[PDB]
From a paper:
We selected the fibronectin type III (FN3) domain, a small β-sheet sandwich of roughly 90–100 amino acids in length, due to its ubiquitous nature across phyla, and its popularity as a model for protein folding and engineering studies. This paper describes the structural and biophysical characterization of FN3con—a consensus-derived FN3 domain having increased stability. We generated the new protein sequence using the consensus method, which selects the most frequently observed residue at each column of the sequence alignment. Design of FN3con was carried out by complete sequence generation using 2123 homologous FN3 domain sequences.
In order to understand the structural basis for stability in FN3con, we determined its X-ray crystal structure to 2.0 Å resolution. FN3con adopts the FN3 fold, consisting of seven anti-parallel β-strands connected by surface exposed loops. A structural alignment with our comparison domains shows very high similarity, with an average root mean square deviation (RMSD) of 1.2 Å across backbone Cα atoms in all structures. Analysis reveals FN3con to have the highest number of H-bonds and salt bridges, with the smallest accessible surface area (ASA). Interestingly, FN3con harbors a unique and extensive complementary charged electrostatic network that is distributed over β-sheet 2, spanning strands C′, C and F. This network results from the presence of four arginine residues and four glutamic acid residues (R45, R49, R81, R83, and E47, E57, E79, E90), which are not present in any of the other FN3 domains. The most striking observation from these calculations is the significantly reduced solvent inaccessible cavity volume of FN3con (60.8 Å3) compared with the next most stable domain, Fibcon (171.0 Å3). All assessed FN3 domains contain the highly conserved tryptophan 22 (W22), while FN3con further contains a unique solvent-exposed tryptophan (W55) on β-sheet 2. W55 packs tightly against the side chains of E47, R49, E79 and R81; however, its effect on stability is not immediately apparent. The hydrophobic core of FN3con is highly regular, exhibiting uniform banding of hydrophobic residues. Structural analysis of FN3con revealed the introduction of a cooperative electrostatic network, optimization of the hydrophobic core packing and accumulation of tyrosine corner residues in a positional pattern that is not seen in any of the other FN3 domains assessed.
Author numbering: 1 to 100
The structure:
């Protein structure tokens, strides 16, 4: 076995979002909810991909705590991760799995 990859992040960047969870799923949409980590937050990167492929991304407001990704393919395995951002850079992600 090899050790796990470390997420390299700038000192001063935020902790991961807390309590990340999927709060609604339809055959073409996924709603995420979370809580802000401590300190200044300037935004959140919401990243997602069909498991195994290429990652899409949307950045949402620092004041946001829920967001719905629409236009997804039915019956599909997805991976989502959310990273908090501030002036020092982006922090480590918290991730969840979903299927539509």
């Amino acid at each position: 076995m090899h050790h796990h990859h470390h997420h390299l992040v700038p000192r001063g960047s935020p902790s991961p979002p807390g309590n990340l969870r999927v709060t609604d799923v339809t055959s073409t949409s996924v709603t995420l909810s979370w809580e802000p980590p401590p300190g200044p937050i300037t935004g959140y990167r919401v990243e997602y991909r069909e498991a195994g492929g290429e990652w899409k991304e949307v950045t949402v407001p620092g004041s946001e705590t829920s967001y719905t990704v629409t236009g997804l393919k039915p019956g599909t395995e997805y991976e989502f991760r959310v990273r908090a951002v501030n002036g020092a850079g982006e922090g480590p992600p918290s991730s969840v799995s979903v299927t539509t």
